[PDB]
Symmetry: C6
Subunit: 66 residues, 6 copies
């Protein structure tokens, strides 16, 4: 449950986010779309990020919560 409304709010409002991968790498951009397994992260070009490789999704400003 929770993931969906939270990611959807980030998508809809085009909130800049930081995504930390399980290996410590930080990606930055905005959530273009997502499904059950992946997130499409936009910047220069989009990239498909697998959820299994993500540790934390951190928005740049406070957002409405589920």
């Amino acid at each position: 449950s929770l993931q969906d409304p939270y990611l959807n709010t980030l998508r809809k409002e085009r909130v800049p986010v930081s995504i930390y991968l399980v290996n410590g790498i930080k990606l930055q951009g905005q959530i273009e779309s997502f499904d059950q397994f992946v997130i499409l992260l936009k910047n220069t070009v989009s990239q498909m990020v697998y959820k299994h490789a993500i540790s934390t999704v951190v928005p740049s400003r406070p957002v409405r919560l589920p």
Copy 2:
């Protein structure tokens, strides 16, 4: 099943106990548990963050808890 995980996280959420969450990569997160589901935890401070359970090694409350 989740017979220990849920009441433990729920108690920490209800009582607003500050926690430390250690990730598998050694990074330490701090805050209060806002809510959780079977896959993620929403950790609160000025901005919340969504933490995937699969990346968590351990949850350490700042003070004692009891089921």
Copy 3:
């Protein structure tokens, strides 16, 4: 729940778009996506290698693509 993953990989495949695949350990693989299923991706170049999805962190096209 592959409503995004499938069409996206399928588009990279059909258009033979050069991609970079980054593994969890930091290795960058380069090539084009020849095929894929629920668990693996067959990546072409000198030889075709089979990459397990569970090892992949990000897939990055060398040029923007349209869904």
Copy 4:
């Protein structure tokens, strides 16, 4: 769980001191207070909830009779 459960339960019942090695090399020490399918509650200086997916090996300080 034909091996995992009675092994963890015996450690718990007999209060055996254990070392838990995490996949990232970190060693936790303590007493097994409780566990379910996914986590172990590790007691001492303060309790902590350890996710099994992060554990590589459980090493008791003395052998246990199953």
Copy 5:
């Protein structure tokens, strides 16, 4: 589903093509595939070793193959 993984590993096993298997920790194994199931691959050489799929990042054949 397994509609790419199984035929690919089976082709490798049947043709006895030597492969390199890279693990997520960066170690490289080499051998021929003797058999496999949903979870493990039996990798042959001096002795046969059992490799869990979850620890594998890529399988690289020594020469290219027909699917």
Copy 6:
């Protein structure tokens, strides 16, 4: 299906094995027992190794295969 008879052979024949973990650590010993999720690796003190943390199991000698 392949895992079980293979593990069973190593056990009942008491073949010494090296077990490599996903972090590169090597464990040595004999397989006392196992279930769907863990392997009990016997020696000095037994230790319960989680399957999710194992990369490869290597017998010290060739064994009959399934």
